[PDB]
Amino acid sequence: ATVIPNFNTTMQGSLLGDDSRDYYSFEVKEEGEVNIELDKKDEFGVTWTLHPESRITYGQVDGNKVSNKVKLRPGKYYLLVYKYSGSGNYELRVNK
């Protein structure tokens, strides 16, 4: 996984051709709501799935944005960005 070292900060990714999955992780130190936002930089079928290291959460696809909010306990989390159709690039933010 690519470590996302802080919140409210943009990551760039790419899912062209054979590249169908990108892996991230982040750590929560204080309980609270996170807003995970993917912004498509190309039109294609992309979403994400969050699961804890120790309930899973999915992105909700709203046009160019694929996002959701969830209250997370302290711990490590894994975030899979993956495609289901086509190819393209994206930006990703874990807001808190």
Q: Does the footprint of Li ion cover residue 37 (CB under 5 A)?
A: no
Question: Both tokens of residue 53?
Answer: 């290291």
Q: Which of 7, 8, 9, 19 binds Li ion (CB under 5 A)?
A: 19
> Which has the closest alpha carbon to 36: 2, 80, 84?
80
User: Can you tell me the distance from the alpha carbon of 74 to that of 92, in angstroms, rounded to the nearest whole number?
Assistant: 21
The partner in contact with residue 59, picked from Cl ion, Li ion, none with C-beta cut-offs of 5 to 8 angstroms by kind, is none
User: Can you tell me the distance from the alpha carbon of 89 to that of 96, in angstroms, rounded to the nearest whole number?
Assistant: 23
Return the residues of window 67-96 that contact Cl ion according to CB under 5 A.
none
Q: Does the footprint of Cl ion cover residue 28 (CB under 5 A)?
A: yes
# chain residues binding Cl ion, by CB under 5 A: 3
- Residues interacting with Li ion, by CB under 5 A? 13-14, 19, 22
